[PDB]
Curated annotation (Swiss-Prot):
Organism: Homo sapiens (Human)
Annotated binding of Zn(2+), by residue: C21, H24, C43, H49
Originating gene: TRIM41
Zinc finger feature spans (B box-type): 16-57
Compartments in which it is found: Cytoplasm; Nucleus
Organism taxonomic ancestry: Eukaryota, Metazoa, Chordata, Craniata, Vertebrata
Protein name: E3 ubiquitin-protein ligase TRIM41
Oligomeric form and interacting partners: Interacts with PRKCA. Interacts with NOD2. Interacts with TRIM17; this interaction prevents TRIM41 activity on ZSCAN2.
Cross-link type Glycyl lysine isopeptide (Lys-Gly) (interchain with G-Cter in SUMO2), residue numbers: K50
Length: 57
């Protein structure tokens, strides 16, 4: 009985879902708990994710 116990280690230990919004280009410091996508201060204020319960990444 064999098994594909082969894989590569994942280094980093740092968040990446807080880069920059490709819309307003603002430091992503919030995450829409309604769309499940990282957003920026502008996005949150934007009616787009304004009504959505956004949280501080
Ligand atoms: Zn934005
Ligand atoms: Zn949203």
């Amino acid at each position: 009985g064999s098994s594909g116990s082969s894989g590569t280690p994942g280094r980093g230990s740092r968040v990446t879902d807080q880069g920059i919004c490709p819309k307003h280009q603002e430091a992503l410091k919030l995450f829409c708990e309604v769309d499940e996508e990282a957003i920026c201060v502008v996005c949150r204020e934007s009616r787009s994710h304004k009504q959505h319960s956004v949280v501080p990444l």
